[PDB]
Design an enzyme around this catalytic site. Structure first.
Site, PDB file in Angstrom:
ATOM      1  N   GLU A 116       1.402  -1.293   0.338  1.00  0.00           N
ATOM      2  CA  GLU A 116       0.207  -0.138  -0.205  1.00  0.00           C
ATOM      3  C   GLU A 116       1.254   1.230   0.380  1.00  0.00           C
ATOM      4  OE1 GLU A 116      -2.070   0.677   3.409  1.00  0.00           O
ATOM      5  OE2 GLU A 116      -3.712   1.655   2.328  1.00  0.00           O
ATOM      6  N   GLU A 200      -8.188  10.165   4.842  1.00  0.00           N
ATOM      7  CA  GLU A 200      -8.787   9.609   6.338  1.00  0.00           C
ATOM      8  C   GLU A 200      -9.625  10.603   7.792  1.00  0.00           C
ATOM      9  OE1 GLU A 200      -5.528   7.084   5.669  1.00  0.00           O
ATOM     10  OE2 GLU A 200      -5.725   5.403   5.905  1.00  0.00           O
TER      11      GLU A 200
END
Ligand SMILES: *[C@@H]1O[C@H](CO)[C@@H](O)[C@H](O)[C@H]1NC(C)=O
Length: 218
Positions: A116, A200
């Protein structure tokens, strides 16, 4: 359009805006996303308010581009992107970041992978990336604090800007090249599964306005 539904998505012209409130269970609050325009790029904004789950991400409202055919990182010539954003709100504990997953298997699910790659253009509050700091690194003419660590079997590399970068222009290929040449990242065998940008959030109340976002794979 606008929606606060947990898994709402608005797609069109090769771009997709998603509420993607995968961590809504971790706290109390809401998240809504508004897609203004998806022509030649994505113009949208995310609004939210969350409490509880101090260090648990509540979601990743984001805009991403379609990737019809997965290609290896090394085969790709460039991954240009531009972003113009601003954040408003109160007691904001959240970030602004690109998110991309890669894996050796080209047909791997697109919301995870062997790796990621995150590029945090913004960081509000005392929130922290996965893993630990590997120190400062230079990519694309800008300095970044690089974080690395595991989130289960997946390895996560997070390049965190040392100043909120509200108007960005870069080439994600530069980041992969850094990993390939300095971290033994197998760029020759890893396929780019996704190319996303969003926020986020952990706690507080905020509105991320993305006046403009563009991304492509050449
Ligand atoms: C981004 O802006 C907020 C609000 O001023 C500030 O608290 C934070 O330290 C900034 N983050 C970075 C990476 O400069």
């Amino acid at each position: 359009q606008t929606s606060c539904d947990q898994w709402a998505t608005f797609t069109g012209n090769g771009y997709t805006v998603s509420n993607n409130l995968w961590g809504a269970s971790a706290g109390s609050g809401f998240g809504c996303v508004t897609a203004v325009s998806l022509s030649g790029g994505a113009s949208w904004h995310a609004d939210w308010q969350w409490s509880g789950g101090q260090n648990n991400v509540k979601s990743y409202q984001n805009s991403q581009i379609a990737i019809p055919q997965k290609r290896t990182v090394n085969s790709i010539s460039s991954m240009p992107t531009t972003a113009s954003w601003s954040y408003s709100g109160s007691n904001i504990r959240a970030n602004v970041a690109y998110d991309l997953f890669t894996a050796a298997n080209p047909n791997h699910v697109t919301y995870s992978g062997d790796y990621e790659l995150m590029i945090w253009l913004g960081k509000y509050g005392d929130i922290g990336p996965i893993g630990s700091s590997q120190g400062t690194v230079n990519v694309g003419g800008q300095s970044w604090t690089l974080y690395y660590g595991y989130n289960g079997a997946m390895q996560v590399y997070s390049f965190v800007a040392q100043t909120n970068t509200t108007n960005y222009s870069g080439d994600v290929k530069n980041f992969f090249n850094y990993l390939r040449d300095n971290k033994g990242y197998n760029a020759a065998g890893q396929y780019v599964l996704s190319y996303q940008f969003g926020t986020e959030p952990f706690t507080g109340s905020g509105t991320l306005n993305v006046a403009s976002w563009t991304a492509s794979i050449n």
